[PDB]
Design a protein around this ligand. Structure first.
Ligand SMILES: Nc1ncnc2c1ncn2[C@@H]1O[C@H](COP(=O)(O)OP(=O)(O)OP(=O)(O)O)[C@@H](O)[C@H]1O
Ligand SMILES: Nc1ncnc2c1ncn2[C@@H]1O[C@H](COP(=O)(O)OP(=O)(O)OP(=O)(O)O)[C@@H](O)[C@H]1O
Ligand SMILES: Nc1ncnc2c1ncn2[C@@H]1O[C@H](COP(=O)(O)OP(=O)(O)OP(=O)(O)O)[C@@H](O)[C@H]1O
Ligand SMILES: [Mg+2]
Ligand SMILES: [Mg+2]
Ligand SMILES: [Mg+2]
Lengths: 433, 485, 117, 212, 105, 134
């Protein structure tokens, strides 16, 4: 059935957003904000007016999506009128952004018709001579908050000076998740900034999510013979308020309120269907969404507890008992083994094997590996590479004492252990202190 | 030869190492540097950003207004101008070396006044009342390294390209040992002086100690943020050498900002334009349309900006934003695309001024999901009971569980408890965290609403509110469910 | 740390291989491409001086890091542990998976000055 | 156009791999995560999936060997161009040195310079980079994975070679640090006792029988 | 500040009654909005509330009682300066949301 | 000499002109309205209790002081930071960005005051409605 293959490919590329520019999907709650972006681009590329603007919104809130849509829409009619320089706050540092801007300037200027040669002082001086009809330079500057540090903000200073005073028209689109982005800026940088902040729209009601799902899953072109029947199946499942798809949209609205989150589950529902009737049954039932939701929680604390052996569960209950009785919540191997040994004698007195410390050591190491115990006052994963490098050159005191004396703390407490251990388990009576 | 690491991206400038002190036999053998071709300055990139235009772009009535209010394109700076011009003129005429300290808040016209003083001095030197001088401008924030100033100034003096230490000794020898009849006066503007402050203060001491030399003929105009920058960040030697007579650039009053904006809009306010009604293109002297921007709107914008900052950039940007809002409404109502009286009203000015005053924190928290609001609400309850301002995440988990299990007769909670704890599904076990727990935790950390401690234990890691508590409560008081319980 | 151990080991390996038979990254990918760069195969003998004074977490992580070279067909690795106290001190500082890894081919050799007079 | 293999207790994971991995870059995610603890069949399922589909172009890297971020970048730069030479031997190429990469933007520039010389190809294809054990890096920090999520955005959209990243993770907390990025994740839960018994029998009886 | 608002509207015009209470409430709301939105020099501040009271009075004459009379003379400033500041206040705070949600009736 | 030839022997008055030109919290307070004096009272009161308090914690104190007094309409957080910027311009407030020193260490913006406390209480006790806010 090549028609179902065509319909499945079309549904997948609608869900990945990789349609052509004239066919690309903009949601209703995203129109006006897009139109605002559509003004600023068109005031820079076409009318040669310099702009600086920061888009503020959470992750996966269609900032990059709307910016790429605007650049691709203006790319097909005004191609020689602008160049694009992309910087990212994660990849580019404060010193490597100059080289990134320079090499992007050569690979963009020859694409229409040197800067990046020499030392950093020479390259920055040549950039300042180049920037400080005319071709509009458009800066897309993601994670702008990483360059608004509390020490010195040289690149933001120079770029906003390029917006303010240069004879070359410059458009800067910063993007961030920080709501209070204007307080991050230094006073002179804040003075040179245009104070134009666009906050991305949030989903306000369930009808916005249902309308966006309808936009994502309706085939508005006739490239398969199965398109029409799929459209009435989708409209029947979306217009029914008591359907499974509306229930899953409502669950996403209350918990995540994220259309990429829903798309990551809808994509393997479409892709794993083999024919048209299987796809219709899958979208009517949405049982694959339940299987997806079960798999997304399979490596959490509950699913990791349900994979434990009897001795592992016994040692974990013993360590939780010792941690609940302790005031700092701290324990070691010796106290947990004492609690385990007392528990096994009190079970066998009313058989169950007592394992020796030599064999309980491996169980303890697996429990540390499965993130049930943490080392006491452990920082863990560091935020940046410099702090991790400093941590790698220091010998911690926990790594020099024997393992039976290392202090540990519980990731799950005994009250949480009693809730999800079944009452038919043989160690269930020891989950209450 | 096997190398322990490689540096395969070395970019080394072609700058020489021999300083100026070793290129002549003696002090008496140095020739007249004024009569030298490379000395004292005696653009190749401008062609690269030009293209051919094949569309007649439509400039409306407000386009000339918005181009007019740009900072790139002095009624209120006449005493600062007089002081700086008198000091610099007296130092040029008497072959003296001096320091002029200027400081102020952003956008109060410091750089503009210094550049106008320098242009008027060049005009005076063109008609021969003062000896000829070189002008050098060094911005501390446009330097990759702070020592590049040493590389810059000497390159403006001799035309040579040296390394920074060799340039520093070259400048030292030139200022100290070269006689005044053999050299030329140099006026150097040090802009953004706080960026030239290092840990050892080498550059600051060198630049303000060269001004104390007899043979230097060096005038340094140092532009800074504050009056007490030497008394805070510099030693007593540099503070002594800078001096005591320091020039304040105070913020503009509302009359001065109003005069600046009216001097921008002098030729186009209350004027007439030829506007083609089919397209909207406006031509200064088909409908004759009269353009005005009201003086009351400009006045109150000047009053607000003058009370806040005195920033001329802020006043110009507020007026430009009001013109942009009026132009957006005009192009919306007239159906004008991109290829009888038009008034920039006071409501547009008040829309421009309030746009940076409306807070999207409460609006952002109002439109969050139920689980993020439940997180914030439980955190507020913990701050109410134990009063810590930092709450453990396990305490938030147990407080969320308690708030669910106590209000178990609330209809919304009855409808949503299976969603929070099983994702609406059988075959999914009772979970220890709610659904989208780390999702809303990372969402509130991304927005800057929360601060999270760097620990690897998820329960005793603490979380602090980064915003004020009453706006969080306010946002929690808008919701119909969290109001009830 | 483990990174310095690997970098010193791979610099020593590359220096010896060039000293007998363009530079590479001092990293375990040199073990991967050793036959492609030198033609012969490889036998590494690791001698750990003063194991009682080393950080046993760092040594343990280096042992699991060296375990990753078993999937390459041309690699043989020998380890020599110079122990000064006894084996019961070093079997309680390593993890049990490391002990199970080291048990498949190991030889004790009690060589000292008091051995048999 | 994907063959779905048969893994004995990883049917959902194999179906998810068939759903997410394809030769079309138009319907393939930029980033894909396979999260599971040790001995859960992540590597086994990924090898069976790529062995059942030989048209998929995969580059296998082990970050546990690479130890730090700089040899990981150099390994990406070396192995991508080696695979591209062994994939299209009739394309004239310039051999860029992988040791030129000391910073992530240098990786972006090197990948751009490698990919612009394959524009004579007819169809857009995917190059899959499997970082099997990303959080097993001994010099790991929280900011490193953020540089790899956004790496496709600094690469040209209209390229014939479109790089796709497949990550493998061990710890749940490391994955849950990046939950708001909404990367598609397939999770590999730990086997139960009957499953590990069956796997042990069908993986070890053949060499227990033929022992000397 | 209730005594100040009462004194200013008493000087402008000529207390639980409906029209006088609504006039004082409107004058208080304009005063509270005026302290933040319109920024006054030291002398002109002394005549703030009078101006606020004045425009409140004008609104009543606009609707709800065309017979109510008011005299600008009670503002202590120069009458040109007082009228100009009154024009600024009236144009700036007529379109405010508290007086878009107010109940003049 | 510069002052003499800018206004046009040199006497005592020009030396005093230099020393007054190139070199006060009573006059700064007197140039404020009743809303800005109210904010400056709650800022100093919030800094006695904490002395390491952010702008959000200073705004936190100001809302509680209004609700027990009901003097002037309560205003928003960004309107509060604007008045703090007005008092920044006047010199009564000195806003810095420094790192907090709790369990979670990040960079926060906090209010510092350095005005003369002897002249602050004299200017505020003349106004009757501000005396609850001392
Ligand atoms: N160029 C693009 N073409 C198609 N879809 C895209 C494009 N860029 C992003 N998307 C999709 O948009 C959704 C999320 O939007 P987007 O990536 O723009 O968010 P964002 O707010 O910019 O994110 P962040 O803060 O993480 O940078 C995802 O489903 C993603 O796949
Ligand atoms: N007196 C003035 N007359 C006209 N325009 C002015 C005046 N002062 C400032 N401006 C405008 O404000 C802009 C900013 O002024 P300027 O660059 O001199 O500020 P600054 O005081 O040096 O501030 P910063 O500390 O941020 O460098 C000028 O480019 C000009 O457009
Ligand atoms: N489903 C299975 N069917 C058959 N054999 C299996 C299966 N799962 C695992 N195995 C066997 O167990 C071995 C371990 O699996 P694998 O290497 O894929 O684990 P992993 O989860 O990737 O581990 P790690 O995180 O430690 O690298 C496989 O190499 C294979 O021999
Ligand atoms: Mg983005
Ligand atoms: Mg300046
Ligand atoms: Mg593996």
């Amino acid at each position: 059935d090549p028609g179902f293959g065509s319909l499945q490919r079309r549904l997948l590329q609608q869900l990945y957003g990789t349609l052509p520019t004239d066919e690309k999907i903009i949601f209703t709650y995203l129109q006006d904000c897009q139109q605002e972006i559509d003004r600023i681009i068109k005031q820079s590329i076409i009318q040669k007016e310099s702009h600086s603007v920061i888009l503020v919104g959470p992750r996966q809130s269609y900032k990059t999506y709307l910016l790429d849509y605007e650049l691709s829409l203006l790319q097909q009619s005004y191609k020689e009128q602008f160049i694009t320089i992309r910087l990212n706050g994660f990849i580019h540092s404060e010193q490597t952004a100059i080289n990134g801007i320079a090499t992007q300037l050569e690979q963009q200027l020859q694409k229409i018709h040197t800067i990046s040669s020499g030392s950093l002082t020479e390259v920055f001086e040549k950039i300042l001579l180049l920037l400080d009809t005319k071709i509009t330079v458009v800066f897309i500057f993601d994670e702008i908050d990483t360059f608004a540090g509390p020490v010195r903000q040289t690149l933001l200073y120079n770029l906003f000076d390029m917006v303010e005073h240069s004879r070359v028209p410059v458009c800067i689109f910063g993007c961030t998740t920080k709501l209070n982005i204007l307080e991050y800026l230094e006073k002179r940088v804040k003075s040179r900034f245009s104070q134009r902040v666009i906050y991305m729209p949030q989903i306000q009601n369930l009808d916005d999510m249902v309308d966006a799902v309808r936009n994502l899953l309706t085939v508005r072109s006739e490239i398969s013979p199965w398109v029409s029947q799929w459209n009435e199946t989708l409209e029947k499942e979306l217009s029914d308020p008591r359907s499974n798809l509306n229930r899953h949209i409502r669950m996403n609205f209350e918990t995540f309120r994220s259309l990429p989150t829903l798309k990551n589950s809808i994509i393997p529902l479409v892709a794993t269907s083999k024919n048209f009737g299987s796809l219709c049954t899958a979208i009517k039932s949405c049982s694959f969404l339940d299987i997806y939701n079960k798999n997304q929680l399979s490596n959490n604390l509950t699913g990791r507890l349900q994979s434990l052996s009897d001795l592992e569960l016994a040692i974990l209950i013993s360590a939780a008992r010792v941690a609940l009785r302790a005031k700092d919540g701290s324990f070691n191997f010796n106290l947990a083994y004492a609690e385990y040994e007392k528990m096994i004698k009190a079970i066998n007195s009313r058989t169950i094997k007592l394992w020796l410390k030599k064999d309980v050591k491996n169980v303890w190491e697996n429990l540390v590996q499965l993130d049930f115990f943490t080392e006491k006052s452990a920082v863990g994963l560091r935020d940046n590479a410099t702090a991790a490098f400093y941590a790698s050159n220091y010998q911690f005191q926990g790594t020099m004492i024997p393992f039976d004396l290392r202090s540990y703390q519980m990731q799950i407490i005994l009250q949480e252990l009693r809730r999800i251990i079944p009452k038919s388990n043989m160690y269930y009576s020891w989950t209450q202190l | 030869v096997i190398r322990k690491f490689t540096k395969k991206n070395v970019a080394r400038a072609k700058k020489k190492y021999t300083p100026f002190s070793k290129r002549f036999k003696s002090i008496a053998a140095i020739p007249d540097l004024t009569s030298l071709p490379e000395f004292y300055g005696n653009s190749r990139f401008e062609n690269k950003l030009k293209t051919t235009q094949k569309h007649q772009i439509v400039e409306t009535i407000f386009s000339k207004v918005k181009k007019q209010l740009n900072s790139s394109y002095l009624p209120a700076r006449e005493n600062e101008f007089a002081s700086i011009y008198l000091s610099a003129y007296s130092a040029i005429e008497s072959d003296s070396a001096t320091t002029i300290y200027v400081a102020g808040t952003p956008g109060v016209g410091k750089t503009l006044t210094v550049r106008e003083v320098v242009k008027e001095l060049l005009s005076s030197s063109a008609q021969r009342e003062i000896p000829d001088f070189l002008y050098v401008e060094i911005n501390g924030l446009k330097m990759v390294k702070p020592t590049d100033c040493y590389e810059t100034l000497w390159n403006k003096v001799s035309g040579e390209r040296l390394t920074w230490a060799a340039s520093m000794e070259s400048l030292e020898f030139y200022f100290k040992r070269v006689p005044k009849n053999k050299k030329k006066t140099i006026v150097v503007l040090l802009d953004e002086l706080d960026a030239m402050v290092t840990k050892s203060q080498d550059i600051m001491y060198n630049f303000f100690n060269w001004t104390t030399y007899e043979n230097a003929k060096l005038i340094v105009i140092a532009v800074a943020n504050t009056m007490d920058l030497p008394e805070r960040q510099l030693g007593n030697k540099i503070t002594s050498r800078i001096g005591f007579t320091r020039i304040m650039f105070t913020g503009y009053t509302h009359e001065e900002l109003k005069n600046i904006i009216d001097l921008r809009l002098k030729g186009l306010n209350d004027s007439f334009f030829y506007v083609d009604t089919k397209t909207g293109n406006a031509i200064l002297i088909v409908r004759k349309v009269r353009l005005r921007m009201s003086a009351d709107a400009i006045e109150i914008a000047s009053r607000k900006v003058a009370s806040v900052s005195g920033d001329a950039r802020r006043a110009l940007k507020v007026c430009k934003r009001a013109a942009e809002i009026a132009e957006k409404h005009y192009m919306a109502k007239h159906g004008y695309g991109y290829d009888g009286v038009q008034t920039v009203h006071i409501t547009h000015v008040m829309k421009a001024l309030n746009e940076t005053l409306n807070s999207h924190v409460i609006t952002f928290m109002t439109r969050l999901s139920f689980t993020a609001k439940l997180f914030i609400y439980a955190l507020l309850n913990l701050m109410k009971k134990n009063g810590s301002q930092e709450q453990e995440l396990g305490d938030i988990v147990d407080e969320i569980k308690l708030l669910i299990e106590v209000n178990g007769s609330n209809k919304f909670v009855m409808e949503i408890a299976k969603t929070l704890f099983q994702q609406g599904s059988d075959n999914i076990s009772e979970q220890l965290r709610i659904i989208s727990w780390d999702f809303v935790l990372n969402q509130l950390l991304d927005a800057g609403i929360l601060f999270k401690q760097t620990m690897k234990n998820d329960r005793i890691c603490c979380v602090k509110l980064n915003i004020s508590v009453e706006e969080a409560k306010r946002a929690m008081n808008e919701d119909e469910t969290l109001r009830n319980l | 740390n483990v990174r310095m151990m690997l970098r010193r080991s791979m610099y020593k390996l590359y220096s010896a291989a060039d000293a007998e038979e363009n530079d590479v990254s001092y990293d375990l990918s040199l073990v991967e491409n050793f036959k492609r760069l030198f033609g012969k195969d490889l036998a590494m003998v690791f001698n750990f001086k003063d194991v009682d004074s080393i950080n046993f977490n760092t040594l343990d992580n280096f042992i699991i890091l060296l375990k990753s070279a078993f999937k390459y067909d041309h690699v043989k690795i020998s380890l020599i542990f110079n122990i000064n106290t006894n084996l019961s001190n070093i079997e309680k500082n390593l993890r049990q998976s490391t002990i199970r890894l080291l048990k498949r081919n190991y030889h004790k050799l009690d060589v000292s000055s008091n051995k048999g007079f | 156009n994907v063959t779905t293999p048969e893994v004995a207790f990883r049917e959902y994971q194999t179906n998810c791999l068939a759903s997410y991995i394809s030769a079309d870059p138009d319907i393939t995610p930029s980033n894909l995560i396979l999260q599971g603890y040790s001995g859960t069949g992540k590597t086994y399922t990924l090898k069976k999936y790529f062995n059942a589909n030989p048209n998929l172009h995969a580059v296998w890297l082990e970050p546990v060997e690479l130890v730090s971020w700089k040899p990981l970048l150099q390994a990406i730069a070396r192995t991508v161009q080696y695979k591209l030479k062994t994939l299209y031997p009739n394309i004239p190429t310039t051999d860029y040195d992988p040791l030129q990469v000391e910073e992530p933007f240098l990786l972006v520039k090197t990948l751009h310079n490698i990919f612009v010389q394959y524009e004579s190809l007819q169809e857009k294809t995917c190059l899959f980079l499997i970082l099997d054990g990303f959080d097993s890096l001994q010099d790991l920090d929280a900011a490193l994975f953020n540089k790899y999520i956004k790496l496709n955005e600094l690469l040209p959209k209209d390229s014939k070679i479109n790089i796709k990243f497949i990550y493998t993770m061990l710890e749940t907390s490391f994955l849950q640090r990046y939950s708001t990025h909404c990367i598609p994740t397939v999770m590999f839960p730990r086997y139960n006792v009957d499953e590990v018994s069956t796997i042990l029998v069908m993986s070890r009886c053949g060499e227990l029988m033929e022992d000397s | 500040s209730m005594q100040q608002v009462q004194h200013c509207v008493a000087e402008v015009l000529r207390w639980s009654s409906g029209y006088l209470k609504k006039l004082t409430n409107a004058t208080s709301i304009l005063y509270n909005t005026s302290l933040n939105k319109v920024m006054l020099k030291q002398d002109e501040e002394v005549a703030r509330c009078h101006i606020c009271a004045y425009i409140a009075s004008q609104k009543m004459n606009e609707k709800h009682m065309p017979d109510l009379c008011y005299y600008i003379d009670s503002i202590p400033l120069e009458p040109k300066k007082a009228k100009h500041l009154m024009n600024l206040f009236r144009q700036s705070l007529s379109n405010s949301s508290p007086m878009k949600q107010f109940a003049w009736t | 000499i510069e002052i003499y030839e800018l206004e046009k022997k040199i006497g005592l008055n020009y030396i005093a002109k230099v020393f007054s030109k190139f070199v006060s919290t009573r006059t700064r307070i007197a140039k404020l309205n009743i809303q800005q004096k109210l904010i400056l009272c709650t800022i100093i009161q919030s800094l006695k209790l904490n002395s390491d308090a952010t702008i959000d914690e200073s705004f936190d104190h100001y809302i509680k002081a209004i609700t027990k007094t009901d003097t002037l309409a309560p205003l928003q957080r960004n309107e509060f930071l604007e008045i703090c910027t007005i008092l920044e311009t006047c010199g009564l407030v000195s806003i810095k960005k420094t790192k907090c020193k709790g369990k979670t260490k990040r960079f926060v913006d906090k209010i510092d005051v350095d005005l003369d406390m002897r002249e602050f209480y004299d200017e505020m006790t003349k106004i009757s409605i501000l005396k609850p806010f001392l």
